[PDB]
Structures are given as structure tokens and as C-alpha cells.
Amino acid sequence: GSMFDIKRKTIEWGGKTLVLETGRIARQADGAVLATMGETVVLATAVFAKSQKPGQDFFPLTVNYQEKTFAAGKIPGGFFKREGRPSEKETLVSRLIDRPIRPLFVKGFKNEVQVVVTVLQHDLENDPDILGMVAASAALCLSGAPFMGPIGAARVGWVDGAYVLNPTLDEMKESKMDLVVAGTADAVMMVESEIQELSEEIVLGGVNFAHQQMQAVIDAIIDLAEHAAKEPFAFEPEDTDAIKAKMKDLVGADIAAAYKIQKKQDRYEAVGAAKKKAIAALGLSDENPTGYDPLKLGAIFKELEADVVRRGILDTGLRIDGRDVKTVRPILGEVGILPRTHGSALFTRGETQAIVVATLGTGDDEQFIDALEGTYKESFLLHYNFPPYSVGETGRMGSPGRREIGHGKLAWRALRPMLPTKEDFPYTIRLVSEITESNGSSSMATVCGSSLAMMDAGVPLVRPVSGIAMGLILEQDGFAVLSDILGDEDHLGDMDFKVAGTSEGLTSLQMDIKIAGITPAIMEQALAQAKEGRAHILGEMNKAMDAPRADVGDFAPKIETINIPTDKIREVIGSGGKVIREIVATTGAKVDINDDGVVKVSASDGAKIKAAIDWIKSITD
Amino acid sequence: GSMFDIKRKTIEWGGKTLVLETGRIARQADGAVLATMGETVVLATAVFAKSQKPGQDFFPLTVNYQEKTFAAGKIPGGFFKREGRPSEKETLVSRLIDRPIRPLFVKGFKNEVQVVVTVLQHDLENDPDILGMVAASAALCLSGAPFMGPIGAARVGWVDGAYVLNPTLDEMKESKMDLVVAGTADAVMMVESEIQELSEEIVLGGVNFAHQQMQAVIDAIIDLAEHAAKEPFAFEPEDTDAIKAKMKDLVGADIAAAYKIQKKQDRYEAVGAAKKKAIAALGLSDENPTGYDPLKLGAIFKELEADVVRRGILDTGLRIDGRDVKTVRPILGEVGILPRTHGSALFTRGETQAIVVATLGTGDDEQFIDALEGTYKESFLLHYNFPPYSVGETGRMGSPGRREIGHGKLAWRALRPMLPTKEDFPYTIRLVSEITESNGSSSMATVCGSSLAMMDAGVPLVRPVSGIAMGLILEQDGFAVLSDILGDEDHLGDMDFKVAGTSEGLTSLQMDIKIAGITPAIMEQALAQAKEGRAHILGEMNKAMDAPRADVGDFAPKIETINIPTDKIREVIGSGGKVIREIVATTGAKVDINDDGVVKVSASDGAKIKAAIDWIKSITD
Amino acid sequence: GSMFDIKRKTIEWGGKTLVLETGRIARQADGAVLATMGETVVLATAVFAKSQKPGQDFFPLTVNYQEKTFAAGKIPGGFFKREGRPSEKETLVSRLIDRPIRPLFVKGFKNEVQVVVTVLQHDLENDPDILGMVAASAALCLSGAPFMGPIGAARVGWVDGAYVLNPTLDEMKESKMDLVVAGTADAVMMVESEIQELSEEIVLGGVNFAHQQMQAVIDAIIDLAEHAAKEPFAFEPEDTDAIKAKMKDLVGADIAAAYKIQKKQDRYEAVGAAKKKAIAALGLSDENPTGYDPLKLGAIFKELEADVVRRGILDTGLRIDGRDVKTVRPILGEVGILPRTHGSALFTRGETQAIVVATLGTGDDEQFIDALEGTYKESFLLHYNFPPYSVGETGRMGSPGRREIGHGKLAWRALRPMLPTKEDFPYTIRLVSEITESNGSSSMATVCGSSLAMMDAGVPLVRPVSGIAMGLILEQDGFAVLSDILGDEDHLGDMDFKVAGTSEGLTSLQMDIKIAGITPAIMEQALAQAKEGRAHILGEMNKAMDAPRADVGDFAPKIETINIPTDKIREVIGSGGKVIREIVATTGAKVDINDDGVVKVSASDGAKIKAAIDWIKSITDE
RNA sequence: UAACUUUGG
């Protein structure tokens, strides 16, 4: 009877029951939502500074998704029994939330914003990640911060050749696609996916499927905001078009005219030149003449640079390097570069390069993951490393940051679906990708190098995988779609996207979108051009390799697998374990019988393994 | 190296020999003492900067208590076999030392000071912590730093109805009270305790007991200082009384009436008016020399503000939030808020709020603590989290800092004495308390939330526990004692204290005191008012619950126990685990046989446990 | 993208094949070399900032040596299964590379430079560390940074009375000396070693041996640089001799007296009377423009500082603290200061002081080290701690930094060779050395205190070990060799070196050298003076102790050991530990079963151990 | 009818 919520218990969303509550908990945050999606509960908070730090210069947004093991009725596994540094899940999901909302803050807003999402209860069916996205969105636009429309989110699956909305953990066991999507009422904003070799049509279909489905939730949020959101924080942007045109009136040609040596990316040299030029004589202090903030001109400059380029590409047709929109950079794959490593590749495309090395392991090498939804054992590990020398800079080394965890994850999603099944190949695989040069999708370079490194390693990959990173320039009067984008091209795009798959379908599509009006018709085309690119890349790729090696490396351990009758396990293990010990001692192979009668035999020889297997079969057949 | 110590191998203190030595070791620190309390030996160092960092702002004191595992003839258990990040003990004891000395530095002093205490040898009887406090004190007032009088410290126990001074680890096994106290010769400064349901009389009796007992040691220190301390470091403020007087006239009346008022949130016009007004009339500008630095004048304002607020309270009797000295804020406890969690509560008191979740576990969930004195297994874990959203702010999230470890520990002390025995309740208990709003003791809110959440979880707590945080205004002509203080109020109080306990006695008393003059007779009253308060709050509390649930939640493992013949264990485990795991997989119950024949079966259904038990017995006959 | 390497697949070097490749990998670094020494492969990069950060102050060089577990076909064993924090090897090898190159950058250069060395493949024979250093050197002087290399490196072994170049890990098993050495064509720059009690003669011999054998690699690099290096980055030094004479005329008196001071530390004198004094005289302003930069005089000031101080020693063999070049500071060792700790010592020499504590443990206490080349179990642990109060400062506490890891390692190398064999003494040893005061080699103080602390602990050390830190002034005419250098004396030396050994030979020699000109005749003498010093110090040391205790501390533990058939290990562990834990529960002894069937049983009583042993034997016999 | 127990990064 104290406190005053205010709930939108409403919505049955995908036939699952979603509650949005505010005004009971954390009433001191700017906005705070306790969201429930039938039995899974998360708390999301938004707080924002009511003023700017002296010379900010960039928008300082922070998102913390965090899981508490009590949400699953467990105590942490660590030696400390307390949750600590974020897990892979926590890192990824934070990014998942960050990505769509970041570019939805009103132009020029650069006050501290922080979103904490804490998962409080996990029902073992509805993943708290999507719920987490929704609750964050809700909290934000309840806070009164200048944050444009609410967003919604959804996960799309593909079972029985049909789209399924927010598939439960169990339903996902059945699905040929894990697609997460976030966007507003107007624009779809973020896509992250893992796909079982499905068609562009299928995938893009699921993108629109989500975009419709999630509207229910966006409406629900807008409803709760109208009963309960705060007074908007007064901050309207600044018509910069005024001063911006009066900058074009000077450094228009002065920039255009010459980036653009190029090399030694300086480029930077002429660039800073132009910057400083407009800076003084543009407008500032004492006084005499003017006027117009000295710091705020910096941002107006980068916007103009950005602009200038785009138009250059829109109107014939050629990009900063001398190349076409459709042109992929020269490519060279090269396998077995580190002959004693289980598998190795060098993949180079233009000025992006990755050394990738496969390593084969046994059961003792697979990774324990203390998931909220119950602990699992991960046998495919991919680690992505982005050292500063790759871009010709110096910088702090040591322990992956978010970006590296993300890119790793992307490449991981790309490759996983092509891995052979346990039965066929009972090894754990760890790929490490070392980005040694970078100028536009090192992550794609990662997937391609991995495809090769695995083949070198002798992994019966069902089909090899390629990746390309794309951009899209969109003006009111027309649009360009860019293939294999440069570093300098990353920010010009209204939308950046990365596609990887096989010669028969997509396996991962990721999309980041900055502005509304990227119409399903444009997206169709974007993908089709990428189809052509990854196809070409694959072409160039498998002239290095083209199919998996017959065998694992001479340094790789040998694991082979065999099935025996369940009622026979007692005779092979023997009276505790008299027989099997003798087999393991004598043949010198590890023999794991577990329990369905699936025996996996390992050793350094092929012979030791066959010696063992022969022994067992004489007892069984 | 020929040496000149200077030793005070002195005092039977509490019947143990205490040695204070200087001049032999660490001669380059400003002060360095090798303290020994009959066989336990620590080295304490004090060093301080001889000048201030440019715009300091706050007094930068650091205390590092650290244990070296060789002190107990052990090698660290880590993978690294080197001692590393501080333990719980290490963090707590540093705070314990920090707390009393921090406010004893001369007003205005803001140079770096660091105290290192290193435990060198542990005799498995006399705890290094107390000795550590002593040693620190000694080193400081030997250093020449502007540190006022020495402090002493003591632990008081309570065995067989009598006060025990510095009880040894064995003595403490019999004691119904762990009370640690620190102070100067004039005042008690710091109290931290864990208490088995003892009366305010007995507790406070123990505080005076310590206060007198420690004088022997303060004496000892004073003595060593005169044989061996350094030249005092020349420093002195800065009298603010003067410039305060020129401002007490200017805005006095202003802020004064500018208070009652009321509502506008913290009175506004005359408030900020007075602020910038007094700023203007003074503070350089300069325009006129003299004076200010509107950092130094800003500080003098805070002091002035406080002074009138306090005066406001002494003369009727009404507080910032317009409540009586004795009035506790509205309170609402709420159980089972996350119904799948083993036990949950939301406790809300005014603008302080904690979500508390109990989680029940077994033996693999209890925490290893390798104390110097012997490694033990902790089965009651309390983790306190203080996210910045609680107070409307943004901040770095991740890895609990000292204050959170402290507060957790406080709440832990408060609850532990009411825990059921292993026999009655064979579970590991982990409470985590998430502070979602904060305006005055979140730690006390944590105790109350915990007491409820445990009851929700079905833990046969012997009695429920409540906590209140109090304050004290002290002027020459009178005093006010405040109940359930606001945040704002912790600043102006001359003494802050936190009391928690049951309907029948105290379970934790913590005190922090900034000034002398805090009479035994005043403390008696202070506690008695708190007695009334925590009683009130308990009243409010248990209208939400009042007694433990008879049973543990449907999601908590139920644990049942049965015996089997030792000569049969092999039949139950079966060939390679084949049987046992079949039973665990099918019945869904975990089965723990170990070894004398004790089988303990657990699961969330009683149906699974009984199914398992039936299965087991058919094999056992 | 098409490549243009440029490889120097050349050199048979010590009968291994060394390849240096550039132009295929990491073409965006300033310099990038993939080096292979027959089947071991590393990638080294060098990058340098083309401009200086605002008011830099110091030359900001960073070296990252890192190993990737795939280089040996293995997956990291962490709970994360990813390489993380650097390992000891990783930390030390970074230092190893850092040390020789740092003082080879052209005077006054203070732009960011970073060297990353990543081990990509390890052939289980040729260590990547030497290769690492070579590759670094190569990458650097391909980058076109102002770096006065190239440098080479080598490791020298001593098997069957002859120097062995770049011994393989198997060859090292037989060697009585692990000596790694780096230098330019003109000077040896860096020496780090662990030595089995070998003569100064033989050790110095190995130093020259390396210096000659490494020329091959230097030349190889110079060759690849001429086919492939970049355009040198224009940065000309600055004739500082110009200003520097003027300042001698001002503060050259003001400095001499302040040193003649002591100990302030402080030194308020130097503070003021250098400082703004010389700056008032010379230095940009507001008031006076023309000329010198307030920053760059700082550097010139330090160099004048050194110059005065040095000169004082050549003119009057008398040093800051009033002592002779050969004079070691007063020394006092003290054992059993922490009588319950297994062994303890206080070592004080002048104003450097270490508390050192030995601790005995069993097999559960030895440290797992998963080297690329094969995971092993380390049973001798030495941890060195250098807390800021030792020098009168305040500072972050916690997790040892590179320097502490290094100094620990140094002391470790110094003592290890005199450890008893496992047979005689089957314990884990952990030494912890707490540096409680410091004014010149705390590391050496560490080895001395350790020698004592282990003796106190009862460890049958074959011979005790001492160490001394030395310096060298080398001028246009003559040279001084300084014994037991002060902190202040570390900076001025053209060469710093630390020597430790027994009364019968050297155990560890470390050298860091700033300039050429150091004839083998100078080193011979330098070492011989140090011989006298460490001899002297040992003398003063075993006034405190003299020989190991007959027995281990009363607070134990004791270990007795027994052999059992391998096919019986199963019956002593029992079904799921059923037997062994019951044995450890009841007898109260730790039970350590190896593989050969070598069981070591340990506890605080002999009675507990015998109970355990009897129990196991009852299971074992007939 | 228990395969040889100890799993801190």
C-alpha cells in the first residue's frame, strides 16, 4: 500500500505470459522494470547523468547483463562460491543489448547512461536473454532519457519448415536456426544468428517474422510508459545543418580532392590538416571572429568527412582504394603453415590477415560451462585474438575484451553447424585465430582461415565455410551496397552486416543497422551481392585446400569410436575391472565405455587403437 | 648493519607477553614495529607523503593487512603456490584497522598514508588481528605523522558468565561473544561484534571492559614513542572557525530559516541561495583579494550546513524528512517473491530496499577457507551487492569492494547465531543480498531480508533477527539519539551504530565514533532506543512471516539418509558405476554412498528419493 | 593478396637451420619477422609511434613474449581453456628481450615502441627463447626505428668440458651451465645464467664463446635488413655536450655537496639546487626565452649528476658514502628470528635488508608448471616481495610485477645448484623473501638470507651461497670496479652485474651492460674483485650460521619413504580411494604414491609415519 | 559387481 505500481501483466506473447512491473523495486533508478516471462524473471534498470562531463566527445553508454546462480537454485561452482567476472554468456548478452539501443539516443546526447540487467529466476525453458533485451528497453523508456521509441526483440527458430517464436530451450533442440533479432516499430536494428545451411529467403523471412512478432511487446512497453514513465529529460538536438553547410563551403574539395595518398594511411596526415584548418577560422574564442564551440566542431567535422565520402561512392561508383562496390580484394589461402600443429592456415584478403590453428583434443580438454540452465560440456572452442600490431598500433596486451569475445563467437556460430557429429569424429576442437593484419572483417578472415585450418587438421567438415563483410550506403535518392568493406568504410554505412555460410546455404548472418528504412527489398539484394562475394571467396579459398585431409596430423592423438551391446559391458569391464584394465595396460589405449555401449578408444598410434578394438570385439562378437 | 632498537618487551597484557620493537627492521619506513604477542609475530609499517597531490580533495589512507602462509609453516594451496589477492580475513582486518585510525588524523591532512601489516608467524592461539591493530597504531605514532594519540584494541569474549580478554582461538570455542573494540585513551572509536543473544547490559559491559583493558597497551605505545618516535611532521591547519564566523553571520539566518520550510526536496531557494550567495560575498573575486578557493569555502559551507541541521534537530526535535528522533520509516516485508528460488524476500524500509535470496546446498557447496590457523569448511555464505542504481548513480559493476565485504560480513555476524545445528538442518546456506535502493543501513535491511528469506526457504532458524542503524548528535548542552537514520544523517552524527538481534538479545553490535565524550550513560540510552526500534521492525517484519516454513521448497533438494552393508557397496555402484548411475538417471535422484555405508539420497521430488531408495534396497536385500 | 618476401633461409647456426622471413605476415607492423630455428617457429613484430606523447619523460619500450599452447599441439588446462595471465617463462623471457635492446635506442628517443613475440610452434627441442630474442632483434632493425642493433643471442652449455652452442632441451639435461647471452657486434650487453659451481675462468670463457658464435646471426640480420628494411625513421640525437658544459659551471658545485650529504634520503639538496636552480640559469620561459627545454634539461641534469658522482670516484677512490671501491657495507645475518617457521633469517647489508623464510612441504605443495615442452612439477619455490615501504615509499600492494618475478628467479638460479638431491631430502622447499629495506641488491640480500634460512630449516645444502652486486665506471683513461653498489650507484655504472656462488665456483652471474669498451681483461678483474666480495660476505654470513642444522624444525614435517610393487598401487589406493583415505584419516599421515611405486609418507610424528608405513606394508607383502 | 583417491588457473 506504500509504493505505487503500475504493472502491464498483459500480453500473452507467442502464447507465453509476459509481465512488465514498475514502481515496487529500485525506485531510485531513473527507470526500473521487473519483467517476467512465465516463471523466468529479470530486473532491468536505467540510470542517466543529468549533465555532461566537461569535454565528453562520445556517448558513454554501458550495459551490464548479469546472472545470479540463485536464479536456478544453485550456488556458484568457483573456489569462492561467489559470482565474479562476466561469463561468455554475460559478455555476449550485454553486447546483444548494447548494439540496438546505442544508436537510438537522440543526436548529440553524450551523458552517462547505464543499464543493469540482473537475471533473478530461470525456469529452465524461456531464456532470460530475450526477456533481458525487452526489460532493458522498457526500463530505458520509462526513465525519461532521450531514447527513441522502445525496441522489441525475439528469437526465431525453424522447426517443421515453419518459423517458431521464442522457442523454448527444449524446442531449440529441434530447430535448424537460432536467430535473435532486435529493432523498433519502424526499423529492424540488430541481427545475430546461427543457421543450419538455410536459404537467404528462409533467413530473411525469419528476420521479418521477428519484426512483426515483437510489435506486440513494443506496444506493451508504450502502454506502460504512458501510465508510469517519468517526465522526459529536456534535451532536444541541435540543427547542425546550419554550421555544417558553412564547413562544406571551405573544406568540401579540401577533403574530397585528396584523402588519399593513400599510404602510409596518411591519409591521416592530410586528414588532420583539413580538420585543424576548419577548427581555427571556423568559429571559437576571443572572439573576434566568433564563435561556435571549439569542441563541438570536431564532431561536425567527422560527420562532414563521412558525408563527403558517401557521395563520392554514390556518384561513380569507386571507393577510397581504387575499387568497385562489387570488388572483393585479392585473396590467398595457405594451409599447413605450421606443419607440427594439428592444422594450420594463413588466410589473407587485402590488408586483413589471420593465422588460424586447429588443435584436436580428447574429453579431458573439453570445456565446463556452468550455465544457469544446467551445466554443459563444450567440445568446440574458438578463440579470437586482436593484437594492436595488426593495425600498426601499440597497445595493452592480455585477456580478451568484449569485442574479441564477440568476434570469436561470430566465427564460432559460422563454423559450428558444419562440424561432424561426435560419432563420426570424437575429438574436441580448439581453433585459435590470430589477427595479424586488419582492414575490414578480421572475423570473416577468422571463419575462412578456420575452414582451412580444420581441413588441414583432417576434420571431416560436412562442407567448407566462407565469410564476407558488407556495407550499405543509403541516401534518399538511391543506395549502394559495398562488398568486403575496409576499416574506413565501417562507419559510413547506415548498415553493416557480416555473412558466412557454405556453398549451399547460410550459417551465420549478423546485422547492425544505424537508421530506418532499410526495406526488405534492399536487404534481399544486399544478401544476394554477399552471396556472390562469399561464393567468390570460397572459390579462392579452396584452391588452397577444397576437401578435408584423409587423416589427422602425425602429432594429433587418435580417437576412434565403436559400439557394443549394452548387456555385454559387464564382460568387457570384467570383475572390477579385471579385463578392461588388462586391455588398457597391455594395448596402451584409453578405453571409455559409457554407457549405451558407446566405447571410444584413444592413443597415439592408429595401431594401439586397433589392438584395443580387436581385443574388445573378440569378447563381444 | 649495526642496529639501534629500542624495544618495549613489556606488559603482561591479558596474561600474554606483548613485545613492541623498533629500529631493527624496515628502518626506511617512517615507522616500523615488530609486534609479538607471545609467539604470534607481525610487522607493521607506516609511511606518509611529505606533501599533498595537487587537487587532492579527500584523505588518502590505505591499510594493507596481509597474511603470509609461511607464518603457519604452510605453502599456499593455489595452483600458483604464492599468496595472491586478499582473502575475506585480509579484507576485513584491513577495514578493522582502517576504521579507528582514519578519523584521528589532524584536520585538513590529506597526504598519502599507507599502513602495511604483515603476519609473519602464527602460534595457533593468539590471533594476529588484534596484535595487528596494535602494531599498526604503534608504527603510526612513531612515524611522526600527524596522528592523534595512540589507539589500542582488544577482543572480549564471554565464557562462564565472565569477560575474557583476548581469548585465544581455543578459548573462543567456548565463548558466547566475539567482540572487538578499538579506541584512544579518551574514547571508544570502533566496535564490531558477533553475539550469542546477549543483553545490551552484557555487551556494553564488554565494551567498557575492553576500553579499560587496552590502556595498558596505549601506555606501552606512548612509552616506546618517547624513546624512538620521530620529529613530528610539521603540519597544522588552518583555523576554519574564523572564516566560518564571517560566513556564519552572512548566510546563518539564511540556511537556518531556509530549512523549515519544508518540502521542495531539501528546501531550495534560500538553500542554494545561501550557497552561491556566501560564495559571492567571499572567495577570491578579486575584485578583492581574500580569500577562499571555493573548494576550501565549499568545505566550510558543508560544515556550516551540518551545524544548522544538527541545531535544528536538538531544538525540536524534527529531522530533515520531518520525522521524530524515535520514528522508524514505514516498512514492508514480502516473502516468496521469486517462488522457484529456494527462499526469497523483499525487504523495504523507507528508501532502503534489499532483494534477498536463500539457496540450499550440500557438501560440495561449502566454501574452503584456508585460515592460517587451520583450513576449515564454511557452510553459511552471505554475499552483499551494492549496485550503483540503488542510489540513482552509475558506476563500475563487478567484483565486490571492501565495503560490500564488510556489510555482507556484518549481516553475516547478525544472522549466524540463530542458525540451526547441522543435525537439524544438514544444508549449506548461501544468502545473496542485492541492495536495490539505499538511504540508510542497507546492511540492516540485509539482515531483515535474510531472516525472512531463510524462513521462506524453510530453515528452522531458532528465532528471527532484525536490525536498525542509529545515529547520535552531541552538543555541549544536550544530545539527540536518532533511529533508522537517513544517508544524509550519517555525516552529521558524532556516532553511528548498527544493532541487530532477536526478541531475546543482541546478535551483532557495530559502532563507529568520531569524537570523545560519548558516555557509558548515553550509550546505555542509545542502545535502549535501538532496542525499541529493532523490536518495532521485527513486529513489522514478521507480519509478513513470523515462523519458518515446515518444509524446504519444491526446488530445494530434499535429503534423506539410509544405511547399507559395506560388503554390498560394490553391488550398488556396479561395474564401472553402471548400476548407480542407472538408478540416478532413471529415478532422477542423486545418490551419495561414502563409505562405512552411509547412503544419502537427494532430489527435488520426494517421489524421486523414494523411487531411488526402493531401488537401492532391492539390491541390498 | 600477393606478397613480396624476402627470406634469409640461411645460416646453419650451431648446426640448426635458422630462417628469417618478412613480407608475408603482419605487413602493417613497422617490422615483422617469422623466425624458424628448425621446426620451432616464432613471430616477432616491432611497432613504433611516429611522434611523442605530450611531455613524455622516459623512453616507453614494451616487450610481450607469449606462448600459445597450440604451438605444442595442446589445449590450455585452465577452467577457461584459454591462455591468460603470463606465465613465469613468459614474464622472464620478456625481460630477457627487453634488457639488451632498451639501451640501444638512439639518445633522446622517447616514442612508444612495442615488441610482440608470439611462439607459434615448438619442436620440443630448440627453445623458443633464444629464437625469440633473435626474431625481436630482426623485427626491430627492419622497422627502421632508431635502434642501434642488430643484437644476437645464444645459450651456452657446458657438457663434457666443452662449450656447447644453443643446447637442445635434451642436451641441457647433461649440461653443467645454462648461460644465456645477448649483445651487438661490438659489445656483450646482457648475461643471465644458472651455473653448477663453475670457475670464473670457465664462465667468462662461455661469455666470449657466445659473443663470437652469435656474430653469424647478427650478420644474417644485417643482410636481411639491407634487402628488406624500411627507410630509417628520421630522428637525429642532440649534441648535449653543448648545453651540458654551461650547467657544470652552475650546479656542478651544488650537486657535489648534496651527495657529500646523506641520507635525506632525500635529497632536498639535489631537489632544489639542480632543478629550478640550473633551470633558472638555462631554460625556456617567460621570462627569458632562448633556450633549453625544462624537460630535456632534466635528462641533461641526471647525466651531469652521474658525471659528477662518477668523476668523484675516479678522483679519490671514495664513493658517496665515504667508502673504498673494494669495501663491502657492514653486514649482519641472524637465524631463527621466527623460531616456529621452518627456517628463518634476517639479512642486513648496509641499508638493504631481507626477511627470509623457508617452508618445507610434501608432494601436494609442489607447483604444476605446464611448459609447452611438457608439464612438470617444481619443488623449489622462491618468491621475492619488494614492498614500497622498503624504500620509504607508498604504493599499490599485490601480485608480483616483472622485476619481482625476475629477482626471485635470479636468487632462485643462485641457490638451486646447491640444493640436496631428492634422495637425501625429499621435501618441497618454498623460500619467501621479504625485502624490508633497500639500497642496492636486495636480490643478493635475498640469496644470502635464503642460504641462512634453509640452513636454519635443516636443509643439507651441499655448500652455502652468497651474492654481491657490482658496478663499473669506465672513462676515457681509466676504470673503477665497485663492490656492493649503492642504489645511487646503479644508475651511473656502464655495467651492472650480480655474482653469486659458493667457495668453489659460480652459481649465477647476471650482467647488464650499457656501452662497448669492456675488454675481457676488465671482466676478468671485475669478477675477481667480486670473488673477494662474495667470499667476504659469505665469511660474515656463516658467523650467523656456518652449517645446516642437524634436523628439520620441530614444526616439521617429517618424510620417510618406501618402495612398493607397481601392480599393488591399486590395493593401497583401494576402490575409489576407500583404503588410502582411511589410512590418511586414521594414521594422520599424508600418503604420496608416485608411479614407480615409490611411496613417500609424511607427518609431524615419526609415530604417524610408521603407522602409515606398517599399514601399507601389510597390504603389500607376500 | 567400485578401473587407481584426491579436478584452486
PDB file of N, CA, C and O in Angstrom, chain A residues 455-479:
ATOM      1  N   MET A 455      40.382 -28.337 -42.209  1.00  0.00           N
ATOM      2  CA  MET A 455      40.675 -29.278 -43.306  1.00  0.00           C
ATOM      3  C   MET A 455      42.126 -29.752 -43.252  1.00  0.00           C
ATOM      4  O   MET A 455      42.409 -30.931 -43.370  1.00  0.00           O
ATOM      5  N   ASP A 456      43.056 -28.831 -43.045  1.00  0.00           N
ATOM      6  CA  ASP A 456      44.466 -29.219 -42.867  1.00  0.00           C
ATOM      7  C   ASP A 456      44.595 -30.244 -41.717  1.00  0.00           C
ATOM      8  O   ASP A 456      45.397 -31.176 -41.795  1.00  0.00           O
ATOM      9  N   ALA A 457      43.801 -30.053 -40.656  1.00  0.00           N
ATOM     10  CA  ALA A 457      43.846 -30.872 -39.452  1.00  0.00           C
ATOM     11  C   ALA A 457      43.253 -32.250 -39.649  1.00  0.00           C
ATOM     12  O   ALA A 457      43.493 -33.153 -38.827  1.00  0.00           O
ATOM     13  N   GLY A 458      42.521 -32.384 -40.764  1.00  0.00           N
ATOM     14  CA  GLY A 458      41.808 -33.588 -41.155  1.00  0.00           C
ATOM     15  C   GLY A 458      40.454 -33.742 -40.495  1.00  0.00           C
ATOM     16  O   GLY A 458      40.101 -34.824 -40.094  1.00  0.00           O
ATOM     17  N   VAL A 459      39.706 -32.664 -40.323  1.00  0.00           N
ATOM     18  CA  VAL A 459      38.370 -32.817 -39.739  1.00  0.00           C
ATOM     19  C   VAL A 459      37.327 -32.954 -40.858  1.00  0.00           C
ATOM     20  O   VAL A 459      37.242 -32.109 -41.741  1.00  0.00           O
ATOM     21  N   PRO A 460      36.589 -34.071 -40.872  1.00  0.00           N
ATOM     22  CA  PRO A 460      35.549 -34.308 -41.864  1.00  0.00           C
ATOM     23  C   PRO A 460      34.404 -33.292 -41.757  1.00  0.00           C
ATOM     24  O   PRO A 460      33.271 -33.659 -41.427  1.00  0.00           O
ATOM     25  N   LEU A 461      34.735 -32.026 -41.987  1.00  0.00           N
ATOM     26  CA  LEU A 461      33.775 -30.946 -42.120  1.00  0.00           C
ATOM     27  C   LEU A 461      32.759 -31.294 -43.232  1.00  0.00           C
ATOM     28  O   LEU A 461      33.151 -31.686 -44.343  1.00  0.00           O
ATOM     29  N   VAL A 462      31.461 -31.155 -42.967  1.00  0.00           N
ATOM     30  CA  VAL A 462      30.479 -31.579 -43.969  1.00  0.00           C
ATOM     31  C   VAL A 462      30.536 -30.729 -45.238  1.00  0.00           C
ATOM     32  O   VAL A 462      30.227 -31.202 -46.300  1.00  0.00           O
ATOM     33  N   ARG A 463      30.971 -29.483 -45.118  1.00  0.00           N
ATOM     34  CA  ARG A 463      31.100 -28.553 -46.252  1.00  0.00           C
ATOM     35  C   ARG A 463      31.926 -27.391 -45.724  1.00  0.00           C
ATOM     36  O   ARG A 463      31.825 -27.086 -44.526  1.00  0.00           O
ATOM     37  N   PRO A 464      32.754 -26.763 -46.578  1.00  0.00           N
ATOM     38  CA  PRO A 464      33.631 -25.708 -46.076  1.00  0.00           C
ATOM     39  C   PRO A 464      32.928 -24.349 -46.024  1.00  0.00           C
ATOM     40  O   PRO A 464      31.921 -24.144 -46.708  1.00  0.00           O
ATOM     41  N   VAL A 465      33.443 -23.420 -45.230  1.00  0.00           N
ATOM     42  CA  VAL A 465      32.703 -22.191 -44.953  1.00  0.00           C
ATOM     43  C   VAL A 465      33.492 -20.909 -45.271  1.00  0.00           C
ATOM     44  O   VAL A 465      34.714 -20.822 -45.042  1.00  0.00           O
ATOM     45  N   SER A 466      32.801 -19.919 -45.830  1.00  0.00           N
ATOM     46  CA  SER A 466      33.416 -18.635 -46.199  1.00  0.00           C
ATOM     47  C   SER A 466      32.617 -17.509 -45.599  1.00  0.00           C
ATOM     48  O   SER A 466      31.471 -17.694 -45.216  1.00  0.00           O
ATOM     49  N   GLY A 467      33.216 -16.333 -45.526  1.00  0.00           N
ATOM     50  CA  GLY A 467      32.562 -15.185 -44.933  1.00  0.00           C
ATOM     51  C   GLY A 467      32.994 -13.921 -45.615  1.00  0.00           C
ATOM     52  O   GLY A 467      34.140 -13.846 -46.080  1.00  0.00           O
ATOM     53  N   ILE A 468      32.083 -12.950 -45.700  1.00  0.00           N
ATOM     54  CA  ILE A 468      32.384 -11.631 -46.266  1.00  0.00           C
ATOM     55  C   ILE A 468      31.718 -10.591 -45.399  1.00  0.00           C
ATOM     56  O   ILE A 468      30.667 -10.853 -44.813  1.00  0.00           O
ATOM     57  N   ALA A 469      32.345  -9.435 -45.244  1.00  0.00           N
ATOM     58  CA  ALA A 469      31.707  -8.348 -44.519  1.00  0.00           C
ATOM     59  C   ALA A 469      31.256  -7.274 -45.495  1.00  0.00           C
ATOM     60  O   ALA A 469      32.049  -6.799 -46.307  1.00  0.00           O
ATOM     61  N   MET A 470      29.991  -6.867 -45.351  1.00  0.00           N
ATOM     62  CA  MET A 470      29.353  -5.931 -46.261  1.00  0.00           C
ATOM     63  C   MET A 470      28.982  -4.606 -45.611  1.00  0.00           C
ATOM     64  O   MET A 470      28.876  -4.487 -44.398  1.00  0.00           O
ATOM     65  N   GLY A 471      28.766  -3.603 -46.446  1.00  0.00           N
ATOM     66  CA  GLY A 471      28.230  -2.327 -46.000  1.00  0.00           C
ATOM     67  C   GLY A 471      27.052  -1.892 -46.871  1.00  0.00           C
ATOM     68  O   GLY A 471      26.809  -2.457 -47.959  1.00  0.00           O
ATOM     69  N   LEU A 472      26.314  -0.893 -46.387  1.00  0.00           N
ATOM     70  CA  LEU A 472      25.274  -0.254 -47.188  1.00  0.00           C
ATOM     71  C   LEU A 472      25.195   1.263 -46.985  1.00  0.00           C
ATOM     72  O   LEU A 472      24.929   1.730 -45.882  1.00  0.00           O
ATOM     73  N   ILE A 473      25.429   2.009 -48.066  1.00  0.00           N
ATOM     74  CA  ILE A 473      25.152   3.440 -48.105  1.00  0.00           C
ATOM     75  C   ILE A 473      23.725   3.647 -48.598  1.00  0.00           C
ATOM     76  O   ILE A 473      23.309   3.069 -49.596  1.00  0.00           O
ATOM     77  N   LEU A 474      22.973   4.461 -47.874  1.00  0.00           N
ATOM     78  CA  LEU A 474      21.599   4.749 -48.219  1.00  0.00           C
ATOM     79  C   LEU A 474      21.348   6.253 -48.188  1.00  0.00           C
ATOM     80  O   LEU A 474      21.374   6.889 -47.128  1.00  0.00           O
ATOM     81  N   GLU A 475      21.108   6.819 -49.365  1.00  0.00           N
ATOM     82  CA  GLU A 475      20.618   8.196 -49.450  1.00  0.00           C
ATOM     83  C   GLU A 475      19.169   8.194 -49.919  1.00  0.00           C
ATOM     84  O   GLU A 475      18.701   7.200 -50.489  1.00  0.00           O
ATOM     85  N   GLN A 476      18.476   9.314 -49.702  1.00  0.00           N
ATOM     86  CA  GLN A 476      17.071   9.483 -50.110  1.00  0.00           C
ATOM     87  C   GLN A 476      16.825   9.130 -51.592  1.00  0.00           C
ATOM     88  O   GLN A 476      15.779   8.588 -51.951  1.00  0.00           O
ATOM     89  N   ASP A 477      17.834   9.371 -52.420  1.00  0.00           N
ATOM     90  CA  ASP A 477      17.720   9.279 -53.872  1.00  0.00           C
ATOM     91  C   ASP A 477      18.263   7.992 -54.521  1.00  0.00           C
ATOM     92  O   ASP A 477      18.156   7.810 -55.732  1.00  0.00           O
ATOM     93  N   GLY A 478      18.803   7.085 -53.712  1.00  0.00           N
ATOM     94  CA  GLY A 478      19.431   5.854 -54.203  1.00  0.00           C
ATOM     95  C   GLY A 478      20.299   5.252 -53.112  1.00  0.00           C
ATOM     96  O   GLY A 478      20.435   5.856 -52.039  1.00  0.00           O
ATOM     97  N   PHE A 479      20.863   4.063 -53.365  1.00  0.00           N
ATOM     98  CA  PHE A 479      21.678   3.370 -52.373  1.00  0.00           C
ATOM     99  C   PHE A 479      22.796   2.566 -53.048  1.00  0.00           C
ATOM    100  O   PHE A 479      22.658   2.153 -54.201  1.00  0.00           O
TER     101      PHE A 479
END
